Structure formats: structure tokens, C-alpha cells
């Protein structure tokens, strides 16, 4: 679909048997979800936003459905205020900016 | 134009007589620039997200030019990693997400 930005670009995701809402975010290089239960092994890692810095767990090769489209990729899990779909996966479902 | 997200969506802006680059960012509600010379007066505001929170100055009805397009709106200036153009100006220049 096409999405204008008068509202926040929130979409439904399925990950790990669970339904979530998540933000499509061209400003984020990676994907980060709020604390959840993922099976499947992880490495610790850090990311930075506006007010500094967080420690997240990295899980690789995770399947995610984003608004009905599938993707597989790296997903961080951690104390983000909101779930964020970043550029690693937006490229896999074909997402562009237009103006 | 049509921007793909294999690279960060950086664009050239002109503001306050100065040329800059900025990130187009659908996951930011606001526009925030690194510290820089702006004329006028402003209010204390605070924003946050992933590392926590920051202190920014708020200047209203700033003219900005984003890849050739002019827009007027609120700009925050502050200790951000990179210049962000948020949804408040993306709507102005007719910007959509598409997949
Ligand atoms: C301030 C940023 C725009 S710039 C920095 C970015 N890091 C990342 O994108 C990693 C990342 C991944 C996921 C989340 C955050 C950060 C970077 O520096 N990228 C160049 C870079 C390239 C190579 C090496 C090193 C750095 N963080 C971004 C950020 O917090 N964006 C928020 C707004 O969209 C995100 C947000 C949205 C809603 C609520 C809260 C936060
Ligand atoms: C973590 C966020 C996705 S969630 C929070 C957001 N705040 C804002 O959008 C204000 C704002 C504006 C600009 C920047 C940061 C924050 C919010 O809570 N939005 C609902 C809301 C609305 C009104 C009131 C309360 C809550 N910040 C975002 C964020 O940092 N995104 C980064 C990734 O794109 C941004 C980024 C990109 C690259 C490098 C570094 C950072």
C-alpha cells in the first residue's frame, strides 16, 4: 500500500506466533522490538538513539510478517519505547519513500 | 522523487542561509537539527526516544528547503546525532511511504 504521514506509520506484524503493531521507520538502520519472548539464541549488542544508548539482544534470521508480507532478518530486542521496523527489513518488503 | 532504503535517505536541506544534509525520518514526529545558528526566539522543550531524553530549543515558523521543496514549520535544535526531518515537514512536501 501507500502510506501518508499525517499519522504515525504503524503496521501489524506477526512474529513468533504473536501479533504486534510496529512503526515503519526510515530513520532506523535496524529493527528493534520491545521486550519479548523469542526462541533461538542471541548475541548482546548496543544501539544509539536520541537520548543515548541501549543494550539489546540480537537474534538473527528471524521470520517476520509485516502487513502480510514476509521477511527474514536480524531483529533486536530491547527497551525501545515502541516496536521499530527499520531499514534492514523495509528493503525486503520493497518499501520506498516518495515525493 | 523515489527513494529506496539500501542507503540512509539523506537529503540536502537549506536553512538559515546554511546548506546541510538531513535524514528523512518517518519514525520521528518532529524535525530536529544539530546545533546551529538560528535567528529568533524559542522555547525549552524536551524530546526523547531510544537513549532517553534530550533538551532542545524550539523555534516556530522556520523556513526550510528540503531537496528543492520549501516548507515552513517547527524545528527543534539540539544534541541529536544527525539532522532529522520528521513527519511534521514530510507531510508538507507530499512525502509518502510505499510498498
Ligand atoms: C538518531 C537516529 C536517526 S541516528 C542513529 C542511527 N542508528 C540506528 O539507526 C540504529 C537504530 C536502530 C533502531 C532504533 C534506533 C536506532 C545511526 O547513527 N545510523 C548511522 C550509522 C551507520 C553506520 C554505523 C553507525 C551509525 N539512531 C537513530 C534513531 O534513534 N532513530 C529514531 C528515529 O527514527 C528511532 C526511534 C523511533 C521511535 C521511537 C524511538 C526511537
Ligand atoms: C523511538 C521513537 C521511534 S518513539 C519517540 C517518538 N518521539 C518523537 O517522534 C520525537 C522525536 C523526534 C525526532 C527525533 C527523536 C524523537 C514518540 O514517542 N512518538 C509518539 C509520541 C508523540 C507525541 C508525544 C509522545 C509520544 N522517538 C522516536 C525516535 O527517536 N526515532 C528515531 C528513529 O527514527 C529518531 C532517530 C533517527 C536517527 C538517529 C537518531 C534518532
Report angle CA A29, B35, B92 to the nearest 5 degrees: 65
Report angle CA A71, A20, B80 to the nearest 5 degrees: 85
Q: Active-site residue B25, yes or no?
A: yes
Sign of CA dihedral B35, B11, B8, B28: positive
Sign of CA dihedral A76, B55, A9, B96: negative
Rounded-to-integer distance, Cα B75 and Cα B24, Å: 14
Q: Does B5 touch chain A (CB under 8 A)?
A: yes
Could you tell me the CA-to-CA distances from A55 to A37, A49, A79, A88, B52 in Å, in that order?
16, 11, 8, 19, 13
Rounded-to-integer distance, Cα A47 and Cα A76, Å: 9
Locate B10 and state its grid cell.
539523506
Technique used to solve these coordinates: X-ray
Residue keyed to cell 515552513? B72
Residue A83: count of CB within 10 angstroms of its CB? 21
Length of chain B equals 99
H-only helix segments in chain A? 87-90
Could you tell me the domains of chain A? Answer: 1-99 (2.40.70.10)
Ligand number nearest CA of B31 is 2
Rounded-to-integer distance, Cα A79 and Cα A62, Å: 19
* DSSP result, A72-90: EEEEEES--SS-EE-HHHH
Can you name the residues that pair with A22 across neighbouring β-strands? A11
Determine how β-strand B69-77 pairs with β-strand B18-24. Answer: unpaired
Rounded-to-integer distance, Cα B26 and Cα B87, Å: 6
Residues contacting B17, CB < 8 A, separation 6+: none
Can you name the residues that pair with B11 across neighbouring β-strands? B22
Say how many CA atoms lie within 13 Å of B39 toward its Cβ: 7
CB-count burial class (<10 Å; 0-12, 13-18, 19+) for B74? middle
* A33 three-state secondary structure: strand
**Ligand 1 atom nearest residue A82's Cα:** 39
Q: Does B8 touch chain A (CB under 8 A)?
A: yes
H-only helix segments in B34-93? 87-90
Amino acid at each position: 500500500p501507500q502510506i501518508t504521514l499525517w499519522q504515525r506509520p504503524l503496521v501489524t506484524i506477526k512474529i513468533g506466533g504473536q501479533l504486534k503493531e510496529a512503526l515503519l521507520d526510515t530513520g532506523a538502520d535496524d529493527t528493534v522490538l520491545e521486550e519479548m519472548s523469542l526462541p533461538g539464541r542471541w548475541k548482546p549488542k548496543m544501539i544509539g538513539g536520541i537520548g543515548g544508548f541501549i543494550k539489546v539482544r540480537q537474534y538473527d534470521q528471524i521470520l517476520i510478517e509485516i502487513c502480510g508480507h514476509k521477511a527474514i532478518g536480524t531483529v533486536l530486542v530491547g527497551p525501545t519505547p515502541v516496536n521499530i521496523i527499520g531499514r534492514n527489513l523495509l528493503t525486503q518488503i520493497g518499501c520506498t519513500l516518495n515525493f
